[PDB]
């Protein structure tokens, strides 16, 4: 019904205004705090280094930003020695496109690289959908056999909560602990990464195996994408199950 | 069947190796070209400015990077205003997650986790709602074509293929070509960068290398284009999905 569609639209628009107000209340004080710090750090630098003009300072910052924007860290020569487009790293980038996560820490800079990325996404994202539906069909049988073992609506609510918590331990809690010890992040940053990854939001502020100073094994990046594949397939199979049940409720 | 699941897995793994090899062939020469430039720009700066040490240079670059990472441009003298924070909220819900703006505060990260968990399904309900209404529009249009070939007897699969190609092209003009032209004139991007942005936005990949508005009605109209754009193409995938389930 269109009456409920317009109703959900109001709930969503109110939700974004609510969200927007909460985010600005939490972030704007720190944003203003950082803005004051960078202005002071720059001014104090020019005060200590008289041989540098404010104009040639700007040019150097721009050169450093353009380098980082390209994907090359302007910090040291040793950090530059590693590549972001190696056979392994470019395989994970491909996966980052296909899963619609799109971190953005690495992005195509080449005009041709952008053209191929457009075509790669258009044909590649449905190809992943087919794989995720495939694992989603097998997991649906696993879920179906587990509910058949156990009011049908109460059983189904108890079942779904258990499956959600099952995935929350196996694909959310356990891998977050691994990232806390491997990537050296805080308890929050680790959970935050896992959540932002599996929701396919992928901000890119936290990316697994991204620190130049980290001596990460060769099996790390493929196992991370494997965790993404099993983690996304699992919670997709759960949403498919809730969707199919809601369609039965409507009819 | 599990035989076809393992088959799709091989196709996908081969696709990522293929993709990975193509991306490195296209990007690694420019990546090495940039790496050489930054090393030279820094070294040439230190030779011109002798009063600056190589270490207190790194410290300044780090301060500039930490500022940009926080969302404050270290070039010249807000990203969390009522309007901008509304669009950020909309970026989370649509799963686009550009990343040009991201929660820095420990509490801001906590709220972002909870906001996504409850907010993304809420969008799914809205997108399904528009997807249901558009499905009736598509369904009534295919039922019109099938009424013509009732006595002419033309395979239902052929009718369904020509119709879907038309709906895909309809969305490609209205929500892909036309808005890309607007971004080319407004944001001042190149013809490629404009199409690339629209594609990376509507696929919800959202790299964040290109973000719209980075007038007051611009940011909400951009999210409105995103809402109708995602909903239209989600209605088309829903239609192809429902038909494939009937085929199985
Ligand atoms: N959640 C909707 C996903 C859907 O979105 C589109 C559809 C079409 C396009 C276009 F035309 F290429 F620009 C981009 C994104 C989609 C993404 C990748 C491949 C096919 C369809
Ligand atoms: N495959 C994308 C769907 C997405 O999947 C999840 C599910 C759960 C989680 C998490 F919160 F971390 F447990 C993160 C992502 C989802 C988000 C909100 C509700 C249900 C599912
Ligand atoms: K993203
Ligand atoms: K996404
Ligand atoms: K994304």
Swiss-Prot record, chain A:
It comes from the Eukaryota. Changing residue 234 to A: Near complete loss of channel gating by mechanical membrane stretch. K(+) 1 binds at residues 100-101, 200-201. Glycans are attached at residues 77, 80-81. K(+) 2 binds at residues 101-102, 201-202. The chain crosses the membrane at residues 5-25, 115-135, 158-178, 223-243. Residues 100-105 are annotated as: Selectivity filter 1. K(+) channel that conducts voltage-dependent outward rectifying currents upon membrane depolarization. Voltage sensing is coupled to K(+) electrochemical gradient in an 'ion flux gating' mode where outward but not inward ion flow opens the gate. Converts to voltage-independent 'leak' conductance mode upon stimulation by various stimuli including mechanical membrane stretch, acidic pH, heat and lipids. Homo- and heterodimerizes to form functional channels with distinct regulatory and gating properties. This is Potassium channel subfamily K member 10. It comes from Homo sapiens (Human).
